[PDB]
Amino acid sequence: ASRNAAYTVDCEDYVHVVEFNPFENGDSGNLIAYGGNNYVVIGTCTFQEEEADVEGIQYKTLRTFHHGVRVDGIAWSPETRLDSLPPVIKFCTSAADMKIRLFTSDLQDKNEYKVLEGHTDFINGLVFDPKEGQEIASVSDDHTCRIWNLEGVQTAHFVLHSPGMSVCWHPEETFKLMVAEKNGTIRFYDLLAQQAILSLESEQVPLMSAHWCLKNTFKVGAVAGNDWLIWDITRSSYPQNKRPVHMDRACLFRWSTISENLFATTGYPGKMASQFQIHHLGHPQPILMGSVAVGSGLSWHRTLPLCVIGGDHKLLFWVTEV
Amino acid sequence: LNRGVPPSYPPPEQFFNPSTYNFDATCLLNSGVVHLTCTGFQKETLTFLKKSGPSLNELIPDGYNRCLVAGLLSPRFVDVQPSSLSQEEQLEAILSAAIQTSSLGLLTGYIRRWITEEQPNSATNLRFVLEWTWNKVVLTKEEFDRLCVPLFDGSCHFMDPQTIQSIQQCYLLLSNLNIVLSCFASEAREITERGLIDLSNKFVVSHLICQYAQVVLWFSHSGLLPEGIDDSVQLSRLCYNYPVIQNYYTSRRQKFERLSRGKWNPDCLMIDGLVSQLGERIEKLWKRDEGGTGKYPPASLHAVLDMYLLDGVTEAAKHSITIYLLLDIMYSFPNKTDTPIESFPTVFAISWGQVKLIQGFWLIDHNDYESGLDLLFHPATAKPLSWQHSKIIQAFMSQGEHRQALRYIQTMKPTVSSGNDVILHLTVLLFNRCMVEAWNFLRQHCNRLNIEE
Amino acid sequence: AGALERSFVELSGAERERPRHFREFTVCSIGTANAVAGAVKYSESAGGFYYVESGKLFSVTRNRFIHWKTSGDTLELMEESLDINLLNNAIRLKFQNCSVLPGGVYVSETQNRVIILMLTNQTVHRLLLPHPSRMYRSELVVDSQMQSIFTDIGKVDFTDPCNYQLIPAVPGISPNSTASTAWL
Amino acid sequence: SLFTSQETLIDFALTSTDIWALWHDAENQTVVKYINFEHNVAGQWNPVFMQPLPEEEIVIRDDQDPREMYLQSLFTPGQFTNEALCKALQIFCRGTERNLDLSWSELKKEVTLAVENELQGSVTEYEFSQEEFRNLQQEFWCKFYACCLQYQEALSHPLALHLNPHTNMVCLLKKGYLSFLIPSSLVDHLYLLPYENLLTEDETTISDDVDIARDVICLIKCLRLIEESVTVDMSVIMEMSCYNLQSPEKAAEQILEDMITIDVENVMEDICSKLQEIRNPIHAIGLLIREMDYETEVEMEKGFNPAQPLNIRMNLTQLYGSNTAGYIVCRGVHKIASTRFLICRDLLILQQLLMRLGDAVIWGTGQLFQAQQDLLHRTAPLLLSYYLIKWGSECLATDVPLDTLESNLQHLSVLELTDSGALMANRFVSSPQTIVELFFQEVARKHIISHLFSQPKAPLSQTGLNWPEMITAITSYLLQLLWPSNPGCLFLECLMGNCQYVQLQDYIQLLHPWCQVNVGSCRFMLGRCYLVTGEGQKALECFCQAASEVGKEEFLDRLIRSEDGEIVSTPRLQYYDKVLRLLDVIGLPELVIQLATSAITEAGDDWKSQATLRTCIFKHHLDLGHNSQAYEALTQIPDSSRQLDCLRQLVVVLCERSQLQDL
């Protein structure tokens, strides 16, 4: 069977991408960002698993920003905080017009952002400098990974052998970047030497999404063809764990924010609903399976065993055992 | 049977004596054949210096006396006794005779070495060559500007080939000095904040001066300079008839004035888009010369050429305006096929997608709406900026071309970058009577503030 | 042709298939079990044959040929085709207590059979196979993979005195001669 | 009486007119040469350009993983045999008798796991550097690669020649594999001739004018000094520039500064000597660029004509159709492309050297400078064309399942494009193919053999097959069917039909920055990639770009065709139909809304077409549960049958989803 959503929130447009804030900087830890056909929305979610006087969920919008294009990807900066007067909301997005939009807001009645241009077709993946907040890495169909400062200048780049599908910055060794390519390769790059470090293979094409386990940095996890794929960098260039997951191909991967053995994956948008699953390395099966009308994106709550997926005019949320 | 390369123009008279021929031969024997090379006394001297390197400091006078017999030294040494120069003077003469065989690589090789050598002497050599190089860039521009005056004084003086060759030598020398300045900038990585800024300013000014020299040279080759003022002498050349082109674009702004009626911009021109990006840097330059306006077209070709000396303007934007003016020059003489204008994209290695963007932007300002659209749709044409989409749509709207605005929107599907552009695209639909499409596009942008507007 | 072809280029048939399965058959040459195992190594060598109808635009032997390789006790044989793939083409024939003769393999076409004449340092052999215009019955093939003339070889008696013969020690082979010739 | 050199004759063959002979030389390289004996007045031997072994050591950069570089080379088409790789693997694994009956896609895994187990067998302490790891990695790979190379020696060694006098087919019996011999073309012949042979060739085959023939022979002697001085670093600079979508004119410009700062013995003084036997280099360059082009007016899509007898057509679909034959044809494309690419590399370097000389040294007036730039503007697209054809002749096709193919075919019949049911007949193959090999076997051979026997110069029961004419013409028409400007789209359609939806993105991306034909068709087929990779919103935008060029490209103007010839509606509405049906058959509601809203701008009063279109849009919105979108898709129906019958789906689907409030 499917599990129904635990919690749901309705929107003024479709949802294409959704990401929680991963950072603990100044009461920001319950922020959520999501993208539609002309805009990006910033809000907060509190749950009955975190505040004991909440029945189920409190969703609250903080600001919407309209920019006349679809939103295709989102990344948060570590500078983001609610403890400050004024607050600081700082993030970036990718969009259909092949450009990056850097947003910085004091939660006033504003529609202010900075544009960064120079990728030549679409941008699949974004990540900030995870520590100081002063740069952005971005991967694209144009066979490049590109680093950019807040001043909007491209500061470094790496050429790829097929479209760049995923990117991850290391939080402690902040000179190390992971990239994954549609050809099935996952590479690590050094930002100070501007060189490749090592690579891994999927055995499978296309690779659609990859993610680095920021609770055990030796673990990589991805989806390619119909498998999910997991490596341990201390052992082999091939997937130490491989399993078929989705019939209609597999699209997204995310490790849990809280547990180095817990992760989630989506199928493709098959005919009525995107299917998704939550997997656990202790188990021979998924522990949760779900299904969403036009189901889009994939993210995890910063502190809960709780995931979010977008879809047809909605955000939908699921809680899991660990 | 060949020579070697002449190390100067004119060559030293020793160069022509038969002891400088290179040639190859076969000897016939009572049993077989054998081949040999006669490497002439220039190649016998250079392949001696190549073998003498490990003791060169003992052999400087022997190398000097060989180069002074092979025709490898400058003619100015032929009256000079080797025993009335220093070993340093004999070494600058030999180093000249080892760069006049080649170009650049010894100087960049000495910079990369003296940085990796520690020595306080070599730190003073690096300083000396940097100060020698910067005073060279200054003196080469002082001589270049002193050469090029007859192109812009209205004198109509067709230049002597020796003046053209002097301008080519100053351009080549500026380029060589630019590569010496970049070789300081790539390797001297511990030069402190203000020294790095002082070096960077010298490289950027040298680069801008090299571009100015390259474009002034091409405008001289393609027959556009000297800037000859209109009086009736029948010769095959092109000329910059600023009066005709000014009467065109001042009449063209008056087409927009009388069609827009104050609902659309009189400055819908694509060229009053391109120049508008560059603003006060050019709007004040195009008022320096008598008859300058601050708007296109410029009042002299020198006001097109000092555009290359601009800081704060990118090369693609400089060349975009230059190609626009070359198209106006070709369109001023449509009784001809004067081809060397058409070299300009290649001589500055500009992409075909940039050339077609400029051509479509020129055709729309010249009142073509067919070739002016379907060259913008042609698949290399560089993806336009949002202000360029809204300029093109406003240019059809300020003229009356309901369908040509819609054909552009239905193809380029452009980024609706503000409420002004939502109002523009709503008008795009409503003037063609696209009433359902206007109502759905209205609903897509009717946000919780601007909905009533 | 219309030009004069002044040079050629080599391309390798370095196929990316699984290693072509040489079906190995032991030629148990009756009587050679008295040989002294001071075996003559010769060199290795190869060779080939073409069908007399292989150049014809509507032949069941069009663009087909036969080729072979030799080492020690062993002869390897294939049929090849540029037109349609040949199932069971690969075989290996292995002559007990003998050495094969380098180039000691000859092929004769007939209007009913292909006939292969083979020599070792102690035994001569005649193998017989069907001709393709006796396997197939049509100027139309419809099969996207064909059988080779070699397919059915597992039905041949290699001990039949009409096919195998021990070479007589008088007149006897000239010691360490590789060279021979064989015909019908 | 015809003499050899000192070379050691391994064997020879004989025709009615010629000898063909095979040697090991002195140092033990394989040599083949031939000589006609009825018409050769000089006694010179004709060369064969042999296939080498792979290179003994691999250059690996400090921006590269050593495992990637060795796992490319070890599995690159035609470097190694499976028979060499499996012997290296059996012995590197130090093993017992494993019968390794493995494919390429199995063998890479046992090879890499053998190297990983031996490398894991070397790390003896608990803390180590990334530098020590890359050194150990590169040692354990070279230690495998040199073992593969020694087993490729021991299988390349020659054992005989074989000749067919019924076809003039010629083969070399190497030890493991078999090799085949093919004629060289005049350009690749003159470029591959070792220099003393290029002092003893006859001028009167290049031109009826000996002076033009001479200027070309001297141009080749300038280009061959660039072959005899350009390094591995400089060849990597060219291929890296062409892969990274950069200017090969500027790759040649940098390589010319690197050469001019390196020249050790005055090579540039002899390039400038040989260039002064030339009188008109612009004409000689224009001729070499002409004999290297493949753009042609040829209607090749006209497959085996319906008036031809069935027995003749089936004998012709079966011509040159074996696995062995397709590999030989596509390695013909590869060795032509991977030679002419180097000719274009050196021709850009020589053009940049001429730009660097101009009016200052040899000739003068800028009419030479322009006419040389007008040639350089062909050398760069010609280099990129041979680079893209090299890449397509090396790039592997994917091990796609039948389930993933029959589904893709059921998603492509929605466009009416395809009598392509023949694709089902032949997929019992024991090997991976390249994307050019796949294209030859299931598309291009079916057209090439239709064309070659369309207007036969003699009766088909009297035509023989002549191998030198047949192979050269088949590879020449396969090059025309792979030419980046070819208006038939058939290569891209073959990749799309065979689900090659990664390689089809990388090919379109290597093509778009410079090629200017088929780009509407490429944005449509890139939209087909993005649908089958789930990026459906990018796919809609790519279909919305490709919509501009309908009425301009044969594939787009083919896509819009019907047997219902009631032509009222616009070609763009006929294209938007073919894309709506696809978004309907995949079931993507956003994209049906956004495309129908886009299509309405272009949609007329086309009452029959509008009645079919709105019936499709209604049904599939109702199937998707977009009931108010389905409601207006039903209100806009002009057909008084469909508007009654569509609501008979609506009332049922609302009742039996219990959506009773809508109802």
PDB file of N, CA, C and O in Angstrom, chain A residues 193-220:
ATOM      1  N   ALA A 193      43.412  23.612  -5.842  1.00  0.00           N
ATOM      2  CA  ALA A 193      44.241  23.080  -6.924  1.00  0.00           C
ATOM      3  C   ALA A 193      43.561  23.181  -8.304  1.00  0.00           C
ATOM      4  O   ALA A 193      44.249  23.201  -9.321  1.00  0.00           O
ATOM      5  N   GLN A 194      42.225  23.268  -8.339  1.00  0.00           N
ATOM      6  CA  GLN A 194      41.389  23.274  -9.552  1.00  0.00           C
ATOM      7  C   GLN A 194      41.599  22.016 -10.416  1.00  0.00           C
ATOM      8  O   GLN A 194      41.754  22.071 -11.633  1.00  0.00           O
ATOM      9  N   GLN A 195      41.585  20.862  -9.741  1.00  0.00           N
ATOM     10  CA  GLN A 195      41.893  19.529 -10.273  1.00  0.00           C
ATOM     11  C   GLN A 195      40.860  18.484  -9.814  1.00  0.00           C
ATOM     12  O   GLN A 195      40.144  18.695  -8.832  1.00  0.00           O
ATOM     13  N   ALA A 196      40.783  17.346 -10.509  1.00  0.00           N
ATOM     14  CA  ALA A 196      40.007  16.183 -10.070  1.00  0.00           C
ATOM     15  C   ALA A 196      40.777  15.356  -9.021  1.00  0.00           C
ATOM     16  O   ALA A 196      42.001  15.264  -9.060  1.00  0.00           O
ATOM     17  N   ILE A 197      40.050  14.743  -8.086  1.00  0.00           N
ATOM     18  CA  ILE A 197      40.601  13.997  -6.944  1.00  0.00           C
ATOM     19  C   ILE A 197      40.484  12.478  -7.149  1.00  0.00           C
ATOM     20  O   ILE A 197      41.457  11.754  -6.960  1.00  0.00           O
ATOM     21  N   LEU A 198      39.276  12.002  -7.471  1.00  0.00           N
ATOM     22  CA  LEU A 198      38.916  10.596  -7.718  1.00  0.00           C
ATOM     23  C   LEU A 198      37.525  10.526  -8.371  1.00  0.00           C
ATOM     24  O   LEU A 198      36.758  11.495  -8.282  1.00  0.00           O
ATOM     25  N   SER A 199      37.157   9.376  -8.948  1.00  0.00           N
ATOM     26  CA  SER A 199      35.783   9.146  -9.420  1.00  0.00           C
ATOM     27  C   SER A 199      35.201   7.752  -9.159  1.00  0.00           C
ATOM     28  O   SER A 199      35.902   6.782  -8.864  1.00  0.00           O
ATOM     29  N   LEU A 200      33.872   7.687  -9.256  1.00  0.00           N
ATOM     30  CA  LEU A 200      33.012   6.530  -9.031  1.00  0.00           C
ATOM     31  C   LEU A 200      32.119   6.293 -10.263  1.00  0.00           C
ATOM     32  O   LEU A 200      31.785   7.242 -10.970  1.00  0.00           O
ATOM     33  N   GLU A 201      31.678   5.054 -10.492  1.00  0.00           N
ATOM     34  CA  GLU A 201      30.738   4.682 -11.565  1.00  0.00           C
ATOM     35  C   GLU A 201      29.431   4.075 -11.040  1.00  0.00           C
ATOM     36  O   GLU A 201      29.408   3.362 -10.034  1.00  0.00           O
ATOM     37  N   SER A 202      28.340   4.314 -11.773  1.00  0.00           N
ATOM     38  CA  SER A 202      26.980   3.818 -11.506  1.00  0.00           C
ATOM     39  C   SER A 202      26.659   2.420 -12.064  1.00  0.00           C
ATOM     40  O   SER A 202      25.664   1.799 -11.678  1.00  0.00           O
ATOM     41  N   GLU A 203      27.445   1.948 -13.036  1.00  0.00           N
ATOM     42  CA  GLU A 203      27.069   0.918 -14.023  1.00  0.00           C
ATOM     43  C   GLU A 203      25.799   1.214 -14.867  1.00  0.00           C
ATOM     44  O   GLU A 203      25.329   0.315 -15.566  1.00  0.00           O
ATOM     45  N   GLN A 204      25.170   2.389 -14.755  1.00  0.00           N
ATOM     46  CA  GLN A 204      23.819   2.681 -15.266  1.00  0.00           C
ATOM     47  C   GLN A 204      23.705   4.096 -15.845  1.00  0.00           C
ATOM     48  O   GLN A 204      24.185   5.058 -15.245  1.00  0.00           O
ATOM     49  N   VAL A 205      22.988   4.220 -16.966  1.00  0.00           N
ATOM     50  CA  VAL A 205      22.734   5.496 -17.651  1.00  0.00           C
ATOM     51  C   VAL A 205      21.246   5.665 -18.003  1.00  0.00           C
ATOM     52  O   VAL A 205      20.604   4.688 -18.400  1.00  0.00           O
ATOM     53  N   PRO A 206      20.680   6.883 -17.900  1.00  0.00           N
ATOM     54  CA  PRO A 206      21.281   8.074 -17.296  1.00  0.00           C
ATOM     55  C   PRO A 206      21.411   7.941 -15.768  1.00  0.00           C
ATOM     56  O   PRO A 206      20.594   7.274 -15.126  1.00  0.00           O
ATOM     57  N   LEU A 207      22.393   8.629 -15.185  1.00  0.00           N
ATOM     58  CA  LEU A 207      22.327   9.046 -13.780  1.00  0.00           C
ATOM     59  C   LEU A 207      21.451  10.299 -13.695  1.00  0.00           C
ATOM     60  O   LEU A 207      21.642  11.231 -14.473  1.00  0.00           O
ATOM     61  N   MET A 208      20.490  10.312 -12.768  1.00  0.00           N
ATOM     62  CA  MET A 208      19.509  11.401 -12.664  1.00  0.00           C
ATOM     63  C   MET A 208      19.747  12.321 -11.465  1.00  0.00           C
ATOM     64  O   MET A 208      19.569  13.529 -11.581  1.00  0.00           O
ATOM     65  N   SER A 209      20.187  11.778 -10.326  1.00  0.00           N
ATOM     66  CA  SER A 209      20.506  12.575  -9.138  1.00  0.00           C
ATOM     67  C   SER A 209      21.436  11.819  -8.191  1.00  0.00           C
ATOM     68  O   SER A 209      21.288  10.610  -8.005  1.00  0.00           O
ATOM     69  N   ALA A 210      22.366  12.540  -7.567  1.00  0.00           N
ATOM     70  CA  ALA A 210      23.282  12.044  -6.539  1.00  0.00           C
ATOM     71  C   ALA A 210      23.372  13.005  -5.340  1.00  0.00           C
ATOM     72  O   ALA A 210      23.122  14.206  -5.469  1.00  0.00           O
ATOM     73  N   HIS A 211      23.750  12.484  -4.174  1.00  0.00           N
ATOM     74  CA  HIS A 211      23.818  13.221  -2.915  1.00  0.00           C
ATOM     75  C   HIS A 211      24.909  12.654  -1.989  1.00  0.00           C
ATOM     76  O   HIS A 211      25.139  11.442  -1.930  1.00  0.00           O
ATOM     77  N   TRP A 212      25.580  13.539  -1.252  1.00  0.00           N
ATOM     78  CA  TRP A 212      26.686  13.204  -0.346  1.00  0.00           C
ATOM     79  C   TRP A 212      26.157  13.119   1.091  1.00  0.00           C
ATOM     80  O   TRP A 212      25.437  14.013   1.539  1.00  0.00           O
ATOM     81  N   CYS A 213      26.465  12.046   1.823  1.00  0.00           N
ATOM     82  CA  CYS A 213      25.912  11.842   3.160  1.00  0.00           C
ATOM     83  C   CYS A 213      26.611  12.732   4.200  1.00  0.00           C
ATOM     84  O   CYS A 213      27.605  12.339   4.808  1.00  0.00           O
ATOM     85  N   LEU A 214      26.060  13.913   4.491  1.00  0.00           N
ATOM     86  CA  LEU A 214      26.620  14.850   5.485  1.00  0.00           C
ATOM     87  C   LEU A 214      26.408  14.420   6.960  1.00  0.00           C
ATOM     88  O   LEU A 214      26.431  15.240   7.877  1.00  0.00           O
ATOM     89  N   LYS A 215      26.225  13.113   7.192  1.00  0.00           N
ATOM     90  CA  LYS A 215      26.334  12.430   8.496  1.00  0.00           C
ATOM     91  C   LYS A 215      27.358  11.279   8.497  1.00  0.00           C
ATOM     92  O   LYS A 215      27.686  10.776   9.567  1.00  0.00           O
ATOM     93  N   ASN A 216      27.893  10.904   7.332  1.00  0.00           N
ATOM     94  CA  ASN A 216      29.075  10.058   7.154  1.00  0.00           C
ATOM     95  C   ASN A 216      29.657  10.330   5.757  1.00  0.00           C
ATOM     96  O   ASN A 216      29.190   9.768   4.764  1.00  0.00           O
ATOM     97  N   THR A 217      30.675  11.186   5.670  1.00  0.00           N
ATOM     98  CA  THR A 217      31.219  11.692   4.397  1.00  0.00           C
ATOM     99  C   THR A 217      31.890  10.631   3.519  1.00  0.00           C
ATOM    100  O   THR A 217      32.183  10.918   2.360  1.00  0.00           O
ATOM    101  N   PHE A 218      32.072   9.394   3.994  1.00  0.00           N
ATOM    102  CA  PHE A 218      32.488   8.274   3.142  1.00  0.00           C
ATOM    103  C   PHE A 218      31.346   7.710   2.277  1.00  0.00           C
ATOM    104  O   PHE A 218      31.624   7.033   1.288  1.00  0.00           O
ATOM    105  N   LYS A 219      30.073   7.978   2.615  1.00  0.00           N
ATOM    106  CA  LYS A 219      28.891   7.481   1.890  1.00  0.00           C
ATOM    107  C   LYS A 219      28.422   8.454   0.798  1.00  0.00           C
ATOM    108  O   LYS A 219      28.061   9.601   1.074  1.00  0.00           O
ATOM    109  N   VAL A 220      28.321   7.948  -0.431  1.00  0.00           N
ATOM    110  CA  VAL A 220      27.635   8.598  -1.570  1.00  0.00           C
ATOM    111  C   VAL A 220      26.373   7.805  -1.896  1.00  0.00           C
ATOM    112  O   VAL A 220      26.380   6.581  -1.767  1.00  0.00           O
TER     113      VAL A 220
END
